Amino acid sequence: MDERDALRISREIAGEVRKAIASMPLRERVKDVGMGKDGTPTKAADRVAEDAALEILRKERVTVVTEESGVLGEGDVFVALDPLDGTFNATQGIPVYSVSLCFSYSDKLKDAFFGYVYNLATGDEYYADSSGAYRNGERIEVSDAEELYCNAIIYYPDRKFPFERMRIFGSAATELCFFADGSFDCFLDIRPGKMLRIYDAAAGVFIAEKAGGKVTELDGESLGNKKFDMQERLNIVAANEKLHPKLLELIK
């Protein structure tokens, strides 16, 4: 498989998932229909998303690692799938929720060759391949903010901070893209519990780096060795090269 296949596949998936969710009323979306392999409830909105995405992905030779159904398939190409990221928003009809896909040539993030995040409520399309990073067909890049007085997405603020704005939109995959396109100056998930799973962050990290951002773990460590498995967990500190080390200091 190559980055063209992955774009094609991701778009087909985006199409079907969007259709499926859009036809499900909010009262159905919000129903708890099962337990996911990740250890959190699967809502009806999650199940329909994942079913639609897997219908397409299983026709391919990949190992899929996805939130509700866990690990599936046997291909040498690994795909990290969040069939619905921002499920709470989707259940409330709040326009920030996405399907997220990251394709890698091994079970480690350093081998990612394609990343794709699609806002299911608005139609906004983010992806990145070897040619750069895109939002709705147009090249994007991270902001050049250097001061701590910047616009931050942060999970979660638990002390006074120097930021100009703090926002928390409820979909990490999309919010990483809000960072990737310059909307926000940084994305921080510093929750001590280390809550992000590989399928939450992977596409967002790949897109953000291709947009020029520096994206690391809590302590500046590379994310390259994060595994595409259900056990993997992440903290993220992401910002342009100038701002990144300042934030690392700040959150010490």
Ligand X SMILES: N[C@@H](CCC(=O)O)C(=O)O
Q: Which residue is nearest to Mg ion (CB)?
A: 36
User: At residue 219, what is the residue type?
Assistant: D
Among 39, 110, 139, 156, binds its own copies (CB under 8 A): 156
Q: Is 123 in the site for ligand X (CB under 6 A)?
A: yes
Q: Which is nearer to Mg ion, 21 or 84 (CB)?
A: 84
How many CB atoms sit inside 10 A of residue 246's CB? 16
How many CB atoms sit inside 10 A of residue 195's CB? 13
**Numbered residues of the known binding site for Mg(2+):** 38, 40, 67, 82, 84-85, 200
Cis previous bond, 156, omega within 30: yes
d(CA 132, CA 95): 26
What DSSP element (H or E) covers 71?
Answer: strand 70-73
How many CB atoms sit inside 10 A of residue 197's CB? 23
Q: Is 96 in the site for its own copies (CB under 8 A)?
A: yes
Residue 113 binds: one of ligand X, its own copies, Mg ion, none (C-beta under 5 to 8 A by kind): none
d(CA 15, CA 2): 20
Q: Which is nearer to Mg ion, 36 or 213 (CB)?
A: 36
> The tokens of 10 are what?
């991701």
Helix (H, G, I), strand (E, B) or coil at 205: helix
Chain positions 5 to 44 lying near ligand X, rule: CB under 6 A, are 11, 14-15, 18
Residues 6+ apart with CB under 8 A from 160: none
> Closest Cα to residue 248, out of 224, 216, 222?
216
Chain positions 176 to 235 lying near its own copies, rule: CB under 8 A, are 178, 181, 183-184
Stretch touching ligand X by CB under 6 A, among 71-79, 119-127, 232-240, 243-251: 119-127
Asked whether 86 and 97 are in contact (CB, 8 A), the reply is yes
User: At residue 137, what is the residue type?
Assistant: G
Q: Which is nearer to ligand X, 170 or 212 (CB)?
A: 170
Q: Which is nearer to ligand X, 90 or 223 (CB)?
A: 90
Q: Is 93 in the site for its own copies (CB under 8 A)?
A: yes
Q: How far is the CB of 165 from its own copies (least distance, A)?
A: 7
H helices within 23-123, ranges in order? 26-29, 44-57, 87-92
Q: Is 122 in the site for ligand X (CB under 6 A)?
A: yes
Count of residues interacting with its own copies (CB under 8 A): 27
Q: Which is nearer to ligand X, 115 or 213 (CB)?
A: 115
Q: Which is nearer to its own copies, 96 or 102 (CB)?
A: 96
Would you tell me which residues interact with its own copies (CB under 8 A)? 88, 92-96, 119, 121-122, 124, 151, 156-161, 165-170, 178, 181, 183-184
Residues of the shown chain interacting with ligand X in the complex, contacts defined by CB under 6 A: 11, 14-15, 18, 121-123, 125
